[PDB]
Amino acid sequence: IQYRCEQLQEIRRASQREVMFSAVDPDLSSSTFLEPEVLRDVREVCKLRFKFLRSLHDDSISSSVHPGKEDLRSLSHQQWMSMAEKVWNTHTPNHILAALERLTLNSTQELKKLQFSQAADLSKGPSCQLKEFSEPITQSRSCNESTHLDPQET
Amino acid sequence: HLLRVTNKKLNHELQSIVNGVQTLMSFFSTPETACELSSQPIFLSQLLL
Amino acid sequence: QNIQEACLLLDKKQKHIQILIKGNSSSKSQIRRSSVEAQKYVQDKLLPWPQE
């Protein structure tokens, strides 16, 4: 009984620690604010579960029922259960809930940024000012001969 | 005299079990019926979703 | 032919969005029930033991 009272009293003392989460101003660059451990661990558990759900969705759209994918799904679910149970045993329920509230707020701001970026493109009339869309990603320079018509001919 | 010492030990362990279980149950009580003490919720079932 | 296959893909994705919206509404309802079940177990089963 005494050992159980000590365990519950430790969870109560852990609950009393206020978790500071950093303000999401969108224009403020890269600065070094350390992410709360609860926010990281809840994000990684949610991201592992999201990857699992996405793999189930991609396999439902691609009619290629490759049978060797079921064993890998069971392993991914057990790995998620063990990590989720670890998170529920390492972090207090209040901190886990506050980390989920922060994750939901971040997801809501990503959707609002996507709404504003597409509205600014419709008000420019047809003048083709191909200005500086800069950064991303890819060009995997390998490929062979083929004739592909550079199709951004207006 | 030995039996009277053993009787005091037995009564102490009986009282410690009573106090131990009352302390244990104080963690499960809902914050509405408890006075103003900072009853920070310990369980997920005690948090307002 | 690619335009027709892409229309069929758009319809499959649209059906899946409807399933996910319905699934998330059900999950929200189930979390609320699980909270009430845990509180009711504490009240009916755990809280009486100190008197016995």
Side-chain angles (χ1 to χ4, degrees):
Chain A
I1 294 163
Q2 234 173 6
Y3 179 71
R4 285 178 165 190
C5 287
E6 286 179 358
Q7 286 189 343
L8 291 176
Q9 198 167 17
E10 194 170 12
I11 299 168
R12 191 181 179 166
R13 287 184 193 125
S15 195
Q16 278 179 341
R17 300 184 211 167
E18 203 174 22
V19 180
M20 292 204 87
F21 304 93
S22 201
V24 195
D25 250 329
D27 276 344
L28 248 83
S29 67
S30 70
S31 72
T32 38
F33 275 94
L34 276 153
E35 189 175 338
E37 205 172 21
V38 188
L39 193 76
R40 183 193 69 196
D41 293 357
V42 174
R43 184 187 299 166
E44 280 300 320
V45 173
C46 287
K47 188 181 182 184
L48 203 101
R49 195 55 175 175
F50 168 77
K51 283 179 179 180
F52 176 79
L53 289 173
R54 186 174 178 146
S55 76
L56 278 161
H57 170 278
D58 295 345
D59 284 348
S60 101
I61 293 168
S62 293
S63 54
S64 58
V65 187
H66 274 297
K69 285 188 176 173
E70 279 187 334
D71 286 333
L72 241 121
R73 284 172 188 188
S74 190
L75 255 149
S76 184
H77 181 52
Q78 283 187 348
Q79 194 178 12
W80 176 72
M81 279 287 291
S82 177
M83 260 193 299
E85 184 171 20
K86 191 180 181 184
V87 166
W88 280 114
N89 289 322
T90 39
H91 299 303
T92 68
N94 181 7
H95 301 165
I96 295 168
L97 193 78
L100 287 173
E101 289 180 355
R102 207 84 183 195
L103 280 161
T104 302
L105 195 81
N106 291 352
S107 214
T108 309
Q109 285 184 346
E110 284 193 341
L111 278 169
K112 286 182 180 180
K113 285 183 179 185
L114 274 152
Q115 277 183 309
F116 273 102
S117 190
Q118 285 184 357
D121 272 336
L122 261 147
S123 160
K124 284 178 181 168
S127 192
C128 316
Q129 286 195 5
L130 277 153
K131 274 199 180 188
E132 302 173 321
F133 274 101
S134 293
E135 277 219 337
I137 288 150
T138 359
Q139 277 187 355
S140 45
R141 256 187 176 180
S142 174
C143 287
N144 287 336
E145 297 184 327
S146 51
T147 53
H148 275 293
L149 282 136
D150 267 322
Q152 283 185 340
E153 285 191 337
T154 43
Chain B
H1 184 271
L2 269 152
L3 281 162
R4 208 182 280 168
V5 174
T6 313
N7 190 54
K8 285 182 180 182
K9 286 181 179 178
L10 187 74
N11 285 343
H12 183 60
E13 283 298 359
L14 280 168
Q15 194 66 42
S16 191
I17 289 169
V18 169
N19 293 349
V21 176
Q22 280 181 346
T23 307
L24 186 66
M25 288 303 155
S26 79
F27 297 111
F28 293 93
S29 304
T30 34
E32 284 188 341
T33 41
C35 281
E36 288 190 340
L37 270 159
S38 74
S39 168
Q40 283 212 355
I42 304 174
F43 298 115
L44 182 66
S45 64
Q46 294 172 341
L47 288 164
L48 292 170
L49 261 97
Chain C
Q1 216 162 17
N2 293 345
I3 291 165
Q4 285 184 344
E5 287 187 1
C7 277
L8 282 166
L9 193 77
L10 263 142
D11 261 10
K12 282 181 180 178
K13 286 185 180 191
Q14 192 67 8
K15 287 174 182 171
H16 222 176
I17 292 169
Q18 289 180 3
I19 292 167
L20 285 171
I21 292 167
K22 194 176 182 180
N24 289 0
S25 180
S26 187
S27 306
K28 178 169 180 168
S29 309
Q30 193 163 6
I31 293 168
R32 279 185 175 169
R33 290 185 214 165
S34 308
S35 192
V36 177
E37 186 177 355
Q39 283 180 348
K40 197 178 183 183
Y41 187 85
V42 172
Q43 257 171 347
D44 289 345
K45 284 274 182 182
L46 281 166
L47 269 154
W49 276 107
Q51 272 203 341
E52 264 174 332

Short mmCIF file of all heavy atoms in Angstrom, two decimals, chain C residues 12-50:
data_model
loop_
_atom_site.label_atom_id
_atom_site.label_comp_id
_atom_site.label_asym_id
_atom_site.label_seq_id
_atom_site.Cartn_x
_atom_site.Cartn_y
_atom_site.Cartn_z
N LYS C 12 -12.50 7.78 -55.46
CA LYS C 12 -12.03 6.88 -54.40
C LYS C 12 -11.50 7.66 -53.19
O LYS C 12 -11.88 7.35 -52.06
CB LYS C 12 -10.95 5.93 -54.92
CG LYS C 12 -11.53 4.76 -55.74
CD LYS C 12 -10.37 3.86 -56.20
CE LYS C 12 -10.87 2.67 -57.02
NZ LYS C 12 -9.73 1.85 -57.50
N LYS C 13 -10.67 8.68 -53.42
CA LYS C 13 -10.16 9.56 -52.36
C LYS C 13 -11.30 10.29 -51.65
O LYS C 13 -11.33 10.32 -50.42
CB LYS C 13 -9.14 10.55 -52.95
CG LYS C 13 -7.80 9.89 -53.29
CD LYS C 13 -6.79 10.94 -53.77
CE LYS C 13 -5.44 10.31 -54.11
NZ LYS C 13 -4.41 11.36 -54.31
N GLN C 14 -12.30 10.77 -52.38
CA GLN C 14 -13.48 11.43 -51.80
C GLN C 14 -14.28 10.51 -50.87
O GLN C 14 -14.67 10.92 -49.77
CB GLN C 14 -14.37 11.96 -52.94
CG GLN C 14 -15.48 12.91 -52.46
CD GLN C 14 -14.94 14.23 -51.92
OE1 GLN C 14 -13.76 14.56 -52.00
NE2 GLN C 14 -15.78 15.06 -51.34
N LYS C 15 -14.49 9.25 -51.26
CA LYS C 15 -15.12 8.24 -50.38
C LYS C 15 -14.30 8.01 -49.11
O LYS C 15 -14.87 7.88 -48.03
CB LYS C 15 -15.31 6.92 -51.15
CG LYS C 15 -16.44 7.01 -52.17
CD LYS C 15 -16.53 5.75 -53.03
CE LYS C 15 -17.66 5.94 -54.06
NZ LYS C 15 -17.68 4.86 -55.08
N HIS C 16 -12.97 8.01 -49.21
CA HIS C 16 -12.11 7.79 -48.05
C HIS C 16 -12.13 8.97 -47.07
O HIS C 16 -12.22 8.75 -45.86
CB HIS C 16 -10.69 7.44 -48.53
CG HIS C 16 -10.03 6.33 -47.75
ND1 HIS C 16 -8.81 5.79 -48.04
CD2 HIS C 16 -10.53 5.61 -46.69
CE1 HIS C 16 -8.57 4.80 -47.17
NE2 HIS C 16 -9.60 4.65 -46.33
N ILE C 17 -12.17 10.21 -47.57
CA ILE C 17 -12.37 11.42 -46.76
C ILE C 17 -13.69 11.32 -45.97
O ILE C 17 -13.70 11.57 -44.77
CB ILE C 17 -12.32 12.68 -47.66
CG1 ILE C 17 -10.89 12.90 -48.21
CG2 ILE C 17 -12.78 13.94 -46.90
CD1 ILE C 17 -10.77 13.96 -49.31
N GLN C 18 -14.79 10.87 -46.60
CA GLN C 18 -16.07 10.68 -45.89
C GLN C 18 -15.98 9.63 -44.77
O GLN C 18 -16.52 9.84 -43.68
CB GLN C 18 -17.17 10.26 -46.88
CG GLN C 18 -17.62 11.39 -47.82
CD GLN C 18 -18.72 10.94 -48.78
OE1 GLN C 18 -19.21 9.83 -48.75
NE2 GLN C 18 -19.15 11.81 -49.66
N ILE C 19 -15.27 8.51 -45.01
CA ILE C 19 -15.05 7.47 -44.00
C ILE C 19 -14.24 8.02 -42.82
O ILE C 19 -14.62 7.79 -41.67
CB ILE C 19 -14.38 6.23 -44.64
CG1 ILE C 19 -15.36 5.54 -45.62
CG2 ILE C 19 -13.93 5.22 -43.57
CD1 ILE C 19 -14.69 4.50 -46.53
N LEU C 20 -13.17 8.77 -43.08
CA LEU C 20 -12.32 9.37 -42.04
C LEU C 20 -13.08 10.40 -41.20
O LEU C 20 -13.01 10.33 -39.97
CB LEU C 20 -11.08 9.99 -42.70
CG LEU C 20 -10.01 8.98 -43.17
CD1 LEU C 20 -8.95 9.71 -43.99
CD2 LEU C 20 -9.32 8.29 -41.99
N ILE C 21 -13.86 11.29 -41.81
CA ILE C 21 -14.70 12.27 -41.09
C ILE C 21 -15.67 11.54 -40.14
O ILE C 21 -15.78 11.89 -38.96
CB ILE C 21 -15.47 13.18 -42.08
CG1 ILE C 21 -14.49 14.10 -42.83
CG2 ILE C 21 -16.53 14.03 -41.37
CD1 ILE C 21 -15.10 14.81 -44.05
N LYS C 22 -16.34 10.49 -40.62
CA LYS C 22 -17.27 9.70 -39.81
C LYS C 22 -16.55 8.94 -38.68
O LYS C 22 -17.04 8.90 -37.56
CB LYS C 22 -18.07 8.77 -40.73
CG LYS C 22 -19.29 8.16 -40.02
CD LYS C 22 -20.13 7.33 -41.00
CE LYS C 22 -21.36 6.75 -40.30
NZ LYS C 22 -22.20 5.95 -41.23
N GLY C 23 -15.37 8.38 -38.97
CA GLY C 23 -14.52 7.69 -37.99
C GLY C 23 -14.03 8.61 -36.87
O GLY C 23 -14.10 8.23 -35.69
N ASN C 24 -13.62 9.84 -37.18
CA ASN C 24 -13.15 10.80 -36.19
C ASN C 24 -14.28 11.30 -35.29
O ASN C 24 -14.10 11.40 -34.07
CB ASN C 24 -12.42 11.95 -36.92
CG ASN C 24 -11.08 11.53 -37.49
OD1 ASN C 24 -10.65 10.40 -37.37
ND2 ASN C 24 -10.38 12.44 -38.11
N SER C 25 -15.48 11.51 -35.84
CA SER C 25 -16.68 11.84 -35.05
C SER C 25 -17.06 10.71 -34.06
O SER C 25 -17.34 10.96 -32.89
CB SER C 25 -17.84 12.13 -36.01
OG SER C 25 -19.01 12.45 -35.29
N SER C 26 -16.97 9.45 -34.50
CA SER C 26 -17.17 8.29 -33.63
C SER C 26 -16.11 8.22 -32.52
O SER C 26 -16.47 8.03 -31.35
CB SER C 26 -17.16 7.00 -34.45
OG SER C 26 -17.52 5.90 -33.64
N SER C 27 -14.84 8.43 -32.85
CA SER C 27 -13.73 8.37 -31.89
C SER C 27 -13.86 9.44 -30.81
O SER C 27 -13.77 9.14 -29.62
CB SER C 27 -12.38 8.51 -32.62
OG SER C 27 -12.27 7.56 -33.66
N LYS C 28 -14.22 10.68 -31.19
CA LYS C 28 -14.54 11.76 -30.24
C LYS C 28 -15.65 11.37 -29.25
O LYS C 28 -15.56 11.67 -28.05
CB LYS C 28 -14.91 13.02 -31.05
CG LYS C 28 -15.31 14.19 -30.14
CD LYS C 28 -15.41 15.52 -30.90
CE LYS C 28 -15.80 16.62 -29.91
NZ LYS C 28 -15.65 17.97 -30.47
N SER C 29 -16.68 10.68 -29.73
CA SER C 29 -17.79 10.19 -28.90
C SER C 29 -17.35 9.08 -27.94
O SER C 29 -17.84 9.00 -26.81
CB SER C 29 -18.92 9.65 -29.79
OG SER C 29 -19.29 10.58 -30.78
N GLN C 30 -16.43 8.22 -28.38
CA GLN C 30 -15.92 7.09 -27.61
C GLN C 30 -14.97 7.54 -26.48
O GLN C 30 -15.08 7.03 -25.37
CB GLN C 30 -15.26 6.12 -28.59
CG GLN C 30 -14.97 4.75 -27.96
CD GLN C 30 -14.70 3.67 -29.02
OE1 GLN C 30 -14.62 3.91 -30.21
NE2 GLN C 30 -14.60 2.43 -28.62
N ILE C 31 -14.13 8.54 -26.73
CA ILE C 31 -13.29 9.17 -25.70
C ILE C 31 -14.15 9.74 -24.56
O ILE C 31 -13.89 9.47 -23.39
CB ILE C 31 -12.39 10.25 -26.35
CG1 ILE C 31 -11.37 9.59 -27.31
CG2 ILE C 31 -11.62 11.06 -25.30
CD1 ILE C 31 -10.65 10.60 -28.21
N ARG C 32 -15.25 10.45 -24.89
CA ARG C 32 -16.20 10.95 -23.87
C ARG C 32 -16.82 9.83 -23.03
O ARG C 32 -16.93 9.98 -21.82
CB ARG C 32 -17.30 11.81 -24.52
CG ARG C 32 -16.85 13.26 -24.78
CD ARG C 32 -18.03 14.09 -25.31
NE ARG C 32 -17.68 15.51 -25.45
CZ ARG C 32 -18.39 16.45 -26.06
NH1 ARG C 32 -19.53 16.19 -26.64
NH2 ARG C 32 -17.97 17.68 -26.08
N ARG C 33 -17.21 8.70 -23.64
CA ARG C 33 -17.75 7.55 -22.89
C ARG C 33 -16.71 6.92 -21.97
O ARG C 33 -17.04 6.61 -20.83
CB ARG C 33 -18.31 6.47 -23.82
CG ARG C 33 -19.60 6.89 -24.52
CD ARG C 33 -20.14 5.70 -25.33
NE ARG C 33 -20.81 6.15 -26.57
CZ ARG C 33 -21.12 5.38 -27.59
NH1 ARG C 33 -20.98 4.09 -27.55
NH2 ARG C 33 -21.59 5.91 -28.69
N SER C 34 -15.48 6.77 -22.45
CA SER C 34 -14.38 6.15 -21.68
C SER C 34 -14.04 6.96 -20.43
O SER C 34 -13.82 6.40 -19.36
CB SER C 34 -13.14 5.99 -22.57
OG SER C 34 -13.46 5.33 -23.78
N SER C 35 -14.08 8.30 -20.53
CA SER C 35 -13.92 9.19 -19.37
C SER C 35 -14.98 8.97 -18.29
O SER C 35 -14.66 8.89 -17.11
CB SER C 35 -13.97 10.65 -19.83
OG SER C 35 -13.56 11.52 -18.80
N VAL C 36 -16.25 8.84 -18.70
CA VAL C 36 -17.37 8.61 -17.77
C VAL C 36 -17.30 7.21 -17.16
O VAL C 36 -17.58 7.04 -15.98
CB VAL C 36 -18.72 8.84 -18.49
CG1 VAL C 36 -19.92 8.53 -17.60
CG2 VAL C 36 -18.85 10.30 -18.95
N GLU C 37 -16.90 6.20 -17.94
CA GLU C 37 -16.74 4.82 -17.45
C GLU C 37 -15.66 4.72 -16.36
O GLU C 37 -15.91 4.11 -15.31
CB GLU C 37 -16.43 3.90 -18.64
CG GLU C 37 -16.39 2.42 -18.22
CD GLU C 37 -16.16 1.45 -19.39
OE1 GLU C 37 -16.13 1.90 -20.56
OE2 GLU C 37 -16.05 0.23 -19.10
N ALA C 38 -14.51 5.36 -16.55
CA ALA C 38 -13.43 5.38 -15.57
C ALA C 38 -13.85 6.07 -14.25
O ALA C 38 -13.65 5.50 -13.18
CB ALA C 38 -12.20 6.04 -16.20
N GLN C 39 -14.50 7.24 -14.32
CA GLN C 39 -15.03 7.93 -13.14
C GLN C 39 -16.07 7.09 -12.39
O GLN C 39 -16.02 6.98 -11.16
CB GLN C 39 -15.66 9.27 -13.53
CG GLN C 39 -14.63 10.36 -13.81
CD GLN C 39 -15.27 11.69 -14.20
OE1 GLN C 39 -16.46 11.79 -14.48
NE2 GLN C 39 -14.53 12.76 -14.27
N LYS C 40 -16.97 6.44 -13.13
CA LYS C 40 -18.01 5.59 -12.54
C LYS C 40 -17.42 4.36 -11.84
O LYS C 40 -17.86 4.01 -10.75
CB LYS C 40 -19.04 5.24 -13.62
CG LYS C 40 -20.32 4.73 -12.96
CD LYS C 40 -21.40 4.42 -14.00
CE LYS C 40 -22.64 4.00 -13.22
NZ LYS C 40 -23.74 3.60 -14.13
N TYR C 41 -16.39 3.74 -12.41
CA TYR C 41 -15.68 2.63 -11.76
C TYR C 41 -15.04 3.07 -10.43
O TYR C 41 -15.14 2.36 -9.43
CB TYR C 41 -14.62 2.05 -12.71
CG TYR C 41 -13.94 0.80 -12.17
CD1 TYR C 41 -14.54 -0.46 -12.37
CD2 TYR C 41 -12.73 0.89 -11.45
CE1 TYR C 41 -13.95 -1.62 -11.85
CE2 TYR C 41 -12.13 -0.27 -10.93
CZ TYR C 41 -12.74 -1.53 -11.12
OH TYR C 41 -12.17 -2.64 -10.60
N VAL C 42 -14.42 4.25 -10.38
CA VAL C 42 -13.82 4.79 -9.15
C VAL C 42 -14.88 5.02 -8.07
O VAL C 42 -14.69 4.58 -6.93
CB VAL C 42 -13.02 6.07 -9.46
CG1 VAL C 42 -12.56 6.77 -8.19
CG2 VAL C 42 -11.77 5.74 -10.29
N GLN C 43 -16.02 5.64 -8.42
CA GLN C 43 -17.13 5.89 -7.50
C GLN C 43 -17.80 4.61 -6.98
O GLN C 43 -18.00 4.49 -5.78
CB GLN C 43 -18.15 6.84 -8.16
CG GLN C 43 -18.01 8.26 -7.59
CD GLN C 43 -18.82 9.32 -8.34
OE1 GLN C 43 -19.33 9.12 -9.43
NE2 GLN C 43 -18.95 10.51 -7.80
N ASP C 44 -18.10 3.66 -7.86
CA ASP C 44 -18.88 2.47 -7.50
C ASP C 44 -18.03 1.35 -6.86
O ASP C 44 -18.55 0.55 -6.08
CB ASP C 44 -19.64 1.93 -8.73
CG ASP C 44 -20.82 2.79 -9.23
OD1 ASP C 44 -21.29 3.67 -8.47
OD2 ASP C 44 -21.30 2.53 -10.36
N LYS C 45 -16.74 1.23 -7.21
CA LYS C 45 -15.90 0.07 -6.83
C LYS C 45 -14.74 0.37 -5.88
O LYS C 45 -14.38 -0.51 -5.11
CB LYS C 45 -15.36 -0.64 -8.09
CG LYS C 45 -16.40 -1.51 -8.82
CD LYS C 45 -16.45 -2.90 -8.18
CE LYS C 45 -17.43 -3.83 -8.89
NZ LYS C 45 -17.45 -5.14 -8.20
N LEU C 46 -14.10 1.54 -5.97
CA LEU C 46 -12.87 1.83 -5.21
C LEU C 46 -13.15 2.60 -3.92
O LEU C 46 -12.71 2.19 -2.85
CB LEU C 46 -11.84 2.54 -6.10
CG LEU C 46 -11.08 1.59 -7.04
CD1 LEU C 46 -10.36 2.40 -8.12
CD2 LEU C 46 -10.02 0.77 -6.30
N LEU C 47 -13.94 3.68 -4.01
CA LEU C 47 -14.28 4.55 -2.88
C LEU C 47 -14.94 3.87 -1.65
O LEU C 47 -14.73 4.38 -0.55
CB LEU C 47 -15.14 5.71 -3.42
CG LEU C 47 -14.28 6.92 -3.85
CD1 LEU C 47 -14.98 7.76 -4.92
CD2 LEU C 47 -13.99 7.83 -2.65
N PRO C 48 -15.68 2.75 -1.77
CA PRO C 48 -16.27 2.07 -0.60
C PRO C 48 -15.28 1.31 0.31
O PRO C 48 -15.55 1.16 1.50
CB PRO C 48 -17.33 1.12 -1.18
CG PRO C 48 -17.69 1.73 -2.53
CD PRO C 48 -16.35 2.29 -2.98
N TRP C 49 -14.12 0.87 -0.20
CA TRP C 49 -13.18 -0.02 0.52
C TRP C 49 -12.68 0.47 1.89
O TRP C 49 -12.53 -0.36 2.79
CB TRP C 49 -11.96 -0.31 -0.38
CG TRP C 49 -12.14 -1.42 -1.35
CD1 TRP C 49 -12.29 -1.30 -2.69
CD2 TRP C 49 -12.27 -2.84 -1.07
NE1 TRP C 49 -12.45 -2.55 -3.25
CE2 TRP C 49 -12.45 -3.54 -2.30
CE3 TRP C 49 -12.32 -3.60 0.12
CZ2 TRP C 49 -12.66 -4.93 -2.36
CZ3 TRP C 49 -12.61 -4.97 0.06
CH2 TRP C 49 -12.78 -5.64 -1.16
N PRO C 50 -12.40 1.77 2.13
CA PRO C 50 -11.90 2.23 3.42
C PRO C 50 -12.84 1.92 4.59
O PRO C 50 -12.35 1.65 5.68
CB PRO C 50 -11.72 3.75 3.29
CG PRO C 50 -11.51 3.94 1.80
CD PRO C 50 -12.40 2.87 1.18
#
